[PDB]
Symmetry: D2
């Protein structure tokens, strides 16, 4: 008899399926930071990694497996073939190649393959331009709107709260503030909702977020955009902050928490938007993905900025060939 058979008596060999499986597509700095953060948060019983660069993919999988002793995710798998992703509860897309067209072409291959092996999964899109690519994943997959989630303004809001926390000398967890709309350069800081312990900063300081503000709090949102380009300039890419923010969304979904996050969802029917566009609003996240969304009261200016983003996104999206 083998040493294994001498040591262990088997009761049954019955075929089993993962109960809390997560797949990460694209093993670049973003995908790998998502992976390590998900692993250290014990959110999955199985992690699958997919990429087109086979050697890097194998190396990344092996490196994570070598740290198994320090984790509570018993199975880590990888492959170019999507059969490794079968029965995933959540599929995170961090894969990426004007730039719009080549990322749409990457999705044309990825999304049907994801849908084939995990037809009941929630899709979480991180790849940029995130608002266009969440629409692209929704269009290709044929999934209901609740199961197609864009990372959207989750990171923008996290950076905003970090900067707010630094100015006030308070932990970001206790500094509330929402950055909504189009992810990136065109995002909207909702000044009316910025508060500490339910105390509105705008009520205390009516000049908040205006050019007349002597303390120039508008700079806090300007620094959210500036910080992102600064990190790229300094280290060539960003990874840690996005990975942590994605694992926070993954936690709400995997644990059915029904916490509210600023993520990209199909906004048709709000703020005079009549087109099939995805923009960030506060969404309730759980086991069914986006089950509900918060209807934020926006000022005329804020509403106009979301409508302008929606018009620009639809302008690009109506010319898209699938």
């Amino acid at each position: 008899a083998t040493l294994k058979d001498q040591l262990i008596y088997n009761l049954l060999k019955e075929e089993q399926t993962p109960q809390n499986k997560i797949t990460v597509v694209g093993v670049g700095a973003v995908g790998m930071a998502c992976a390590i953060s998900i692993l250290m948060k014990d959110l999955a019983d199985e992690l699958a990694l997919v990429d087109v660069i086979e050697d890097k993919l194998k190396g990344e999988m092996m490196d994570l497996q070598h740290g198994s002793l320090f984790l509570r995710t018993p199975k880590i798998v990888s492959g170019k073939d999507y059969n490794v992703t079968a029965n995933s509860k959540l599929v995170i897309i961090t894969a990426g190649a004007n730039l719009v067209q080549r990322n749409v072409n990457i999705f044309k291959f990825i999304i049907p393959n994801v849908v084939k092996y995990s037809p009941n999964c929630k899709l979480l899109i991180v790849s940029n331009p995130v608002d266009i690519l969440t629409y692209v994943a929704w269009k290709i997959s044929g999934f209901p709107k609740n199961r197609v989630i864009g990372s959207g303004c989750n990171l923008d809001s996290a950076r905003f709260r970090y900067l707010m926390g630094e100015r006030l000398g308070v932990h970001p967890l206790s500094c509330h503030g929402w950055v909504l709309g189009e992810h990136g350069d065109s995002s909207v800081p909702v000044w009316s909702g910025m508060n500490v312990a339910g105390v509105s900063l705008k009520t205390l300081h009516p000049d908040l977020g205006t050019d007349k503000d002597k303390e120039q709090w508008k700079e806090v949102h300007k620094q959210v955009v500036e910080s992102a380009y600064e990190v790229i300039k300094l280290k060539g890419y960003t990874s840690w902050a996005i990975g942590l923010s994605v694992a926070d969304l993954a936690e709400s979904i995997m644990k059915n928490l029904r916490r509210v996050h600023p993520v990209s969802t199909m906004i048709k029917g709000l703020y005079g938007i009549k087109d099939d566009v995805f923009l960030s609003v506060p969404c309730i996240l759980g086991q069914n993905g986006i089950s509900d969304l918060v209807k934020v009261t926006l000022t005329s200016e804020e509403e106009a900025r979301l409508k302008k983003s929606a018009d620009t996104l639809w302008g690009i999206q109506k010319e898209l060939q699938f």
Copy 2:
């Protein structure tokens, strides 16, 4: 008054010393993996990062700070100057660069780092990750002037973790329940201690006396060979290794910061054991806590195992006695 003063009334300005500070020196793939793993394990109330590449260092610090909302480490700092590292409980060194020439280049790097670390955190524990780890732990010990308990080498911690992963894969059991120790010199010359390999206290060697020999039909020696083979394979495939070392270092940091007194295979002063008479650092199971290595486990080794550690000690001392401090 300012909006801050309108919103918040201050009771005291008194800002005390950080109580559970960790410093990571070198922000390459290894140091950053150590950093993220330490952050996600809530081991520090302050994290300091140091490197000579100023742009990369700032970018890495900012990227970690941007994830603050999702962490419980309220202060993340960085700088080329070691004043940012003041009052660290633990300092992790991952900085580094013919073989005697390569080691000498790391000695010259350590000649700059170690006095600067000692200046700002004289009571810290030093955790050496930089390769060749056994030699560089000796170098850090020699330069710092610290007692042996406060100078810890990552040593065979990763080698053992990989061994347990491979053992777990062969047996269909979680690595946490697969016990096995890889000791001695970190890397190619490490020693798998076959006598201690067990599941639930059941010795694999007692069940299978050929275990770890060339006459073994199942070739369990391949499990230790795969520990060394895997490391080169990861380098070939992605260019470096990061995740496994980062996780293993954070596991050591946890025992130290939380004074757990768990047993880990780390590099310590082995003079006085296995006929070793030279000032060399080799991995043995050590009890880790608030004062670093307080104790070590005296593993019963066979004549062959003892000879391999003695040969490693002789080779290490041969390189060490020629180094310029």
Copy 3:
């Protein structure tokens, strides 16, 4: 020689002291729920338990110690003598029993406890849970002689947590995303701050102007009424409350031990606010960290809310001025 000496070689026999010690005074249902929650959150390297009932105290300590394999707190100690509490960073008081006769009995208990706590941990933060919490936080502050930042009352922490649970149930949103503050005097006379009630920064009062009034067709005033009613209902149903308070106390302990600077509704010296001139403790949002309450949030209250806090401060002072120290 001994088996221990054959197995383990000792490097140093250095006497060490805990770096993150927490003491719980009173091992009743509340005290023990605080201890298990603190243990499962890895907040302490040492946990000390104190009580006057010696058999129950020993039994509780042993029961916790027997679960050590599943915890990361290496030392659990207990005793009637306060020498077991020496060098505590945080001391949690859950000890205690006409309503006025009751207060004086708790004052008598505190006259023994507080000097003993101060003697062995002069630099600790005191966290008062025992009822009437606002009066007993004042009593602990007066007896200890500690600055106001190091005397914290559990106050409206639990009231706010229950409010957020009830708000969450009505809206179908996790309590973490349902923001609402219950301030002032803990218990029956607490104040729900309707203006701050929000989800994602969207004011419920702006959306529903009748919120918190008798005109309200949805009767949101019942949410605050149910916070008070729930507490008496749990007592009626199981005889005491433990789990919710223990979890809420461990959340405060986390901000203090980890120097998080998160904002919590806790009882603090409110003299100088809302026209209050007496030495009384009431709940306001406080920034909690390594120095206890370093700062407080100045909540804009309506004239009605301000009047309720002033009436509570007058009533608390009325009881306080008659206490014998």
Copy 4:
């Protein structure tokens, strides 16, 4: 429109069948310690509590729900009716029943299980059953017989706590964390448990090899006292506080973690041992078992000395003696 409808736009009202649900039957000190430990370890997305004392059950549920802000288990439910337990992955039985007969107390607990087990099976036919109620070895057998479940899905807490206490005591003597002190207590849970001296080690270094007198009466250091103290400790906690709760709750949550997360870690739990150590009867005894999503998929075959083998066989004979007389 309601304030909720003004604030929130609903995408779908559809509620999925429970995905990672745990049920705790019996809300005494043991059940509630299991419940708080499971909650603080984020093992379940839904926790169900069942008991026959309706007021205490409601009070315990409400108390846990009031701490929701500090937890990541979004749904806590309770009831006397087992419809609240539907689709549980794992069902933990802690419900239990002045000097009566040995067979008398067992039959009282058997009567309770005759009501519980069919109700559990009705609403969660595919669950894993984890038995904590005493006498655990007999009651795991009873749950197995009544349920009709395959042996892999019926797990007894067994010697999990005995081993945890042993490792704590070993750790205290050696000045090492219990996580690094390895040692197995097997067989019959409680008074008749077997310390496996041959497997006692630190870093793979056998204590028995270093100290051949280990676990014998001639031992000058009396290491037998470490196992004697495991049994003595249990009675001492009962004498001092009236019951035990924290240690059992933590040990049960550790088993729940391996099952819910399919970890395949090895634990000393009670399993149907027929076919081992000359045991021919349908009895449950503790051996190291691999725990995962299908419950006990495998077991470790520990080499026992003649004396150790004899003690397990004597336990098996005693347990079968009681079981063959039980009225179902």
